[PDB]
């Protein structure tokens, strides 16, 4: 489980900062409420789609697991890479997702909790 401040620093390093007009707080909150700072977290779906990575990227439209029928695999990368401990691929395809046009509204956790809240407080007190 990566540290909150450590996770924010990693996101800043990977370039996710200042992307699509969202601060680090939005991304940190989304990760926290999507996988509780646990990149290994894996979740299924009612339709059968699988979610991998800290940001819980859906398999149906984003990553190519091969287990989900009619997969659009927008990420164009295997879901295993997202399931990898490092968050580089997660950050990259999250940039892609937020670049879809609807912003961070795609992620359910961000809308539920990280939308219209003090997201920047997540990176507070982290010496970043």
């Amino acid at each position, epitope marked *: 489980v990566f540290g909150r401040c450590e996770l924010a620093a990693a996101m800043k390093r990977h370039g996710l900062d200042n992307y699509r007009g969202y601060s680090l707080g939005n991304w940190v909150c989304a990760a926290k409420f999507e996988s509780n700072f646990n990149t290994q977290a894996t979740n299924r*779906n009612t*339709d059968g789609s699988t979610d991998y990575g800290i940001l819980q990227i*859906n398999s*149906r*439209w984003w990553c190519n697991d091969g287990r989900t029928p*009619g997969s*659009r695999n*927008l990420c164009n990368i295997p879901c295993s890479a997202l399931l990898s401990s490092d968050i580089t691929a997660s950050v990259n395809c999250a940039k892609k997702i937020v670049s*879809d*046009g*609807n*912003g961070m*509204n*795609a*992620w*359910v956790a961000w*809308r539920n909790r990280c939308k219209g809240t003090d997201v920047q407080a997540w990176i507070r007190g982290c010496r970043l």
Partner: nanobody, 126 residues
Framework: DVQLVENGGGCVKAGGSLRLSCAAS????????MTWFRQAPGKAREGVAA????????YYTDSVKGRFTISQDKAKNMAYLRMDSVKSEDTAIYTC????????????????????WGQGTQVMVS
């Protein structure tokens, strides 16, 4: 558990303004996209006016560009499609599809993507 219903339709001469309405029930919160699909006789079901509940962005096919507008109300979890300057080709059965997952913009008009559908409402042009 979202059930889609449609209201309106009927005979509307060329240039008549028709107000089609759609509603959602049950777990309406999970809904992400709302789209209208026309099942023209002899043609496959095709999207008409896609929409995203939260952002409110509206996407329309080329044919209905500048003539049909779709808007929704968050409180009532309903979406209604305005119609104007209707023509002969507009005669078809309109279906208000919905989905519980965030579909990409390019697939917003795809019928297969949507996981919900409702009883289509027929639209005829005099």
């Amino acid at each position: 558990d979202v059930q889609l219903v449609e209201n309106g339709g009927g005979c509307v001469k060329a240039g008549g303004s028709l107000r089609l309405s759609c509603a959602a029930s049950g777990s309406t919160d999970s809904i992400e996209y709302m789209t209208w699909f026309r099942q023209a006789p002899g043609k496959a079901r095709e999207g008409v006016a896609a929409l995203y509940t939260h952002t409110g962005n509206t996407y329309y096919t080329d044919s209905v560009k500048g003539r049909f507008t779709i808007s929704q109300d968050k409180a009532k979890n309903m979406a209604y499609l305005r119609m104007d300057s209707v023509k002969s080709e507009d005669t078809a059965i309109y279906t208000c599809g919905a989905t519980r997952k965030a579909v990409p913009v390019r697939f917003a008009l795809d019928q297969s993507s949507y996981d919900y559908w409702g009883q289509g409402t027929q639209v005829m042009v005099s």
